[PDB]
Symmetry: C2
Subunit: 87 residues, 2 copies
């Protein structure tokens, strides 16, 4: 046979490793143009111990929350490009 | 066919219609704490014709570049929830 179907969660681990010099090279024209400004302070609130269900949503949405808008575009393009050549 | 209008009920066209309270109802603890304390839209305009090759990458990246980070997380969660139950 030609090979395995292979892992798909490793694409998040690649986007977590690379930098804005790699992101601008793949987003190109559609790369971000600023406008959000700057600020500070905690905004209040505290952790009351974590909670979870089914596991897949908590692992995935945590990475999506940690990542930049540039990285959110890069992981979305990756998962669309790899799925259309499966099966 | 040379092209199509696409469905009205895609995850992209749904997330572009619903409000920040509907995003908070599915992001939960992972909802953003930034900007005014609740995030917001960014991306700006666009320029020049697209390249002659492909289009499914360019239209998708073009939409995502103008969405809020809350919307980018929610459309990604929706397309993750449906792909893991295929068979």
């Amino acid at each position: 046979g030609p090979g395995s179907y292979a892992p798909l969660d490793t694409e998040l681990s690649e986007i977590e490793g690379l930098q804005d010099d790699d992101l601008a090279a793949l987003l190109g024209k559609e790369f971000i143009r600023e406008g959000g400004g700057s600020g500070g302070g905690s905004g209040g609130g505290s952790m009351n111990k974590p909670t979870s269900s089914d596991g897949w949503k908590d692992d995935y949405l945590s990475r999506l929350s940690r990542l930049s808008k540039n990285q959110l575009m890069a992981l979305a393009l990756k998962l669309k490009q790899q799925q259309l050549e499966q099966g």
